[PDB]
Amino acid sequence: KRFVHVKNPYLDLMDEDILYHLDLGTKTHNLPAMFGDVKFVCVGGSPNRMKAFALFMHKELGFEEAEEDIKDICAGTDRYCMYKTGPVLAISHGMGIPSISIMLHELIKLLHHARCCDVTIIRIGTSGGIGIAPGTVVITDIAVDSFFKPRFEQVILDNIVTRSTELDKELSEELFNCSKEIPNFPTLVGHTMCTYDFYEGQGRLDGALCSFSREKKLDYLKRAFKAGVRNIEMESTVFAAMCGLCGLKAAVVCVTLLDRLDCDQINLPHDVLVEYQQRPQLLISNFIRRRLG
Amino acid sequence: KRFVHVKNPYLDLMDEDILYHLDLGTKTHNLPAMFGDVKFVCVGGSPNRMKAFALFMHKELGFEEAEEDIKDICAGTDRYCMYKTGPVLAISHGMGIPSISIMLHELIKLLHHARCCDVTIIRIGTSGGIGIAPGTVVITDIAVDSFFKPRFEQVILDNIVTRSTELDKELSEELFNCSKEIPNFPTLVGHTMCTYDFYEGQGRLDGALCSFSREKKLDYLKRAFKAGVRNIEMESTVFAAMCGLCGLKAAVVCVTLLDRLDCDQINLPHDVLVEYQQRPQLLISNFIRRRLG
Ligand SMILES: O=c1[nH]c(=O)n(COCCO)cc1Cc1ccccc1
Ligand SMILES: O=c1[nH]c(=O)n(COCCO)cc1Cc1ccccc1
Ligand SMILES: [Co+2]
Ligand SMILES: [Co+2]
Ligand SMILES: [Co+2]
Ligand SMILES: [Co+2]
Ligand SMILES: [Mg+2]
Ligand SMILES: [Mg+2]
C-alpha cells in the first residue's frame, strides 16, 4: 500500500491542521471517515466543470452522487470545490500555477490525514495545440517550462529551487492504451508547455501587451514543436512536481481548442466546443472503469 | 482626458476581439455603451466577494444595482465575474499572478474598446501581516517580489523581461488621507510582498512541503520587515506592473488576518474575521464618495 506522503516534519507536531481553502480541518472533521476511500482524484479549473464531472461519474460508473448542501454552496467562494462520488474525488483549482499550488498543498495534506493509499491523480482541461488538429486529446509525457525544459522553479523564502516535472510513465501509457478503445477520439502523447501568462507567455498577438512580431511568435511555437511540445496550458509543471515529490502517481490530459500556428482566438461553433471540452472526462471514465473491473 | 491605452500594435488590426474569459467581444457587444461610463474598477478574488462589493456600492453610494441574469450566472464558471453599479465596475480575479494577469489583459482591452477615460483601479483583499496587528488595513506604497525587490519578471516567449511595480503615489496618499476619517480603522502605508506560493513562498511551516526551519522562516520575515514589507499577498506585483504599463492609476488595499511572526493559520472568531474582511471595501467606498462629491 502506497500511502500519500507529505514532506514536512512540522505537520505531525501541530495540534490541529486547518485546510482553509478546502473548508476542512482535522479537528472539525473526521477526515479518514470522509475521504479514506478515495482512490482517484480528478482536478480541473472551474467548480462547474468539476461538479459536471462528478455527475458524469455517477452516470457512467454508478457511484453514489455527490451530496449538495444548499446552505453552503462552494461555487463563487474563495474555496476549492470538491465533489465526491464513491472512490472518485473531483476538485476545482482555478487558473494558473499559484492557484493550483494552494489546492495541491491542502489536497495532499487531506489525503495524508485521511490515510488514503494507492491514489491516482489526473488533471483534465483545455489547452492550445501546436501543429495538431483542434479537438485532439493530448496525454502529457513530460511537462516543460517556457524554455522547453522539464523543470519547475520554486521560490522558497528568498531562494530558487528547481524540481523535476516527471509524470508517471506507466500511467500515461495506460491512458493512451485506453484511448485506442474510443472511436472518433483523436489522441496523442506529447510534451505539454506550462506558462505563467496566457497572452505574451504563449506567444499571443491579442493581449493588452504584445512586445514581439508574428514572425517571432511563429518561430517560438515552431521551436516548441521541434522540442516535442504539442500543447500549452497553465498548471502542468507545478502539478507534476508536487505530485512527484509526495509520491502520488499523476497524469495530465487536456484537449486542444485551436492550432496556435494558425490563430489565438477560438473559432468553433458552440456545439463543437462542447463536444471537445468533454473529451478528457470521457477518457478518464474509461480509465477508471478499467481499473475497477 | 487620460484614455486607457494598450501596448499592442496588432489589436487595432483585428476584425474582432473576443474577450473569452469575460464573455464579451467587440462584435457581440456594444462595449462603449456598456462600459464607457466606468471611472472606478475594483478587483478582488472571488465572484461572491465582488458581488457583495457591488451591493455595498449600491447601498453606500446609491448607484443603480448590478443586474442579474438568472440563466447565465457567472459564479462557478471559468470566467471572471463582473458587477457594475453606475461608474463602479467590480471584477473577480481568482488567486495568484497568472489568474489576475488573464483578467487584466482582457479588462484593460475592455476599457480601451469602451473608450473609458480617467479610470482608477484598486485591488482589495486579504493578506498576512508582518509585525503589525491583525485587522490592519495596509495601503501598498510599493509592491515587491520574494527578494524584496520592486520588480515583476515576465516571461515573454522564452525571454525574461523585468518590469517596474510602481503604484500611483498620489493615489496611495489620498487613500491614506481618507482612512484618517474612519474611526476604529487601523491603517498604514507599507510595502507589500507578492509571492507565487502561499506556503513555502511565504515561509509557512504548515504546507504539504516545508524544506526549512522555523528559525529560517522568522529570519526571512524579519528581513522582509526591515526592508519595509508589512503584508504578504499574491497579486500586487503583476497588478502594479500591468496597470503601470497601460497608464492606469492603481492602488492595493488589503487587510491582514494574522501576524505571520506568530502563526500561519488564522485563529479569530468568525464574526471578527467578517469585520476584518469588509475593511478594505469600507475605505474604497469613502474614497469613491469623496472623488464624486
Ligand atoms: O490557448 C490556450 N492556452 C491555455 O493555457 N489554455 C488553458 O486554460 C487557460 C484558461 O482558459 C487553453 C487554451 C485554449 C484557449 C484559446 C482561446 C481562448 C480560451 C482557451
Ligand atoms: O497569509 C496570507 N497570505 C496571502 O497571500 N493572502 C492572500 O490570499 C491568498 C488566498 O487566500 C492571505 C493571507 C491570510 C491568510 C492566512 C491563513 C489562511 C488564509 C488567509
Ligand atoms: Co502526518
Ligand atoms: Co522532446
Ligand atoms: Co485600439
Ligand atoms: Co523599504
Ligand atoms: Mg494547423
Ligand atoms: Mg505579533
Curated annotation (Swiss-Prot), chains A, B:
Subunit structure: Homodimer.
InterPro entries: Nucleoside_phosphorylase_CS, Nucleoside_phosphorylase_d, Nucleoside_phosphorylase_sf, Uridine_phosphorylase_euk
Binding residues annotated for phosphate, in chain numbering: 45, 79, 123-126
Keywords attached to this entry: Disulfide bond, Glycosyltransferase, Redox-active center, Transferase
Gene Ontology terms for molecular function: deoxyuridine phosphorylase activity; identical protein binding; uridine phosphorylase activity
Enzyme nomenclature, EC number: 2.4.2.3
NCBIfam families, A to Z: euk_UDPppase
Entries under CDD domains matching the protein: UP_hUPP-like
Catalysed transformations (reactions): uridine + phosphate = alpha-D-ribose 1-phosphate + uracil; 2'-deoxyuridine + phosphate = 2-deoxy-alpha-D-ribose 1-phosphate + uracil
GO cellular component terms, A-Z: cytosol; type III intermediate filament
Binding site for uridine: 127-128, 202-204
Metabolic or biological pathway, per its Swiss-Prot or TrEMBL entry: Pyrimidine metabolism; UMP biosynthesis via salvage pathway; uracil from uridine (phosphorylase route): step 1/1
Family: Belongs to the PNP/UDP phosphorylase family.
Tissues where the protein occurs: Predominantly expressed in kidney.
A Pfam family matched in the record: PNP_UDP_1
SS bond list: 74-81
Record-given protein name: Uridine phosphorylase 2
Activity control note: A conditional disulfide bridge can form within the protein that dislocates a critical phosphate-coordinating arginine Arg-79 away from the active site, disabling the enzyme.
Biological process annotations from GO: CMP catabolic process; dCMP catabolic process; nucleoside metabolic process; UMP catabolic process; UMP salvage; uridine catabolic process; uridine metabolic process
Gene that specifies this protein: UPP2
Gene3D superfamilies in the record: Nucleoside phosphorylase domain (3.40.50.1580)
Reported function: Catalyzes the reversible phosphorylytic cleavage of uridine to uracil and ribose-1-phosphate which can then be utilized as carbon and energy sources or in the rescue of pyrimidine bases for nucleotide synthesis. Shows broad substrate specificity and can also accept deoxyuridine and other analogous compounds.
Superkingdom assignment: Eukaryota
Keyword Glycosyltransferase found: yes
Keyword Coiled coil: no
Species of provenance: Homo sapiens (Human)
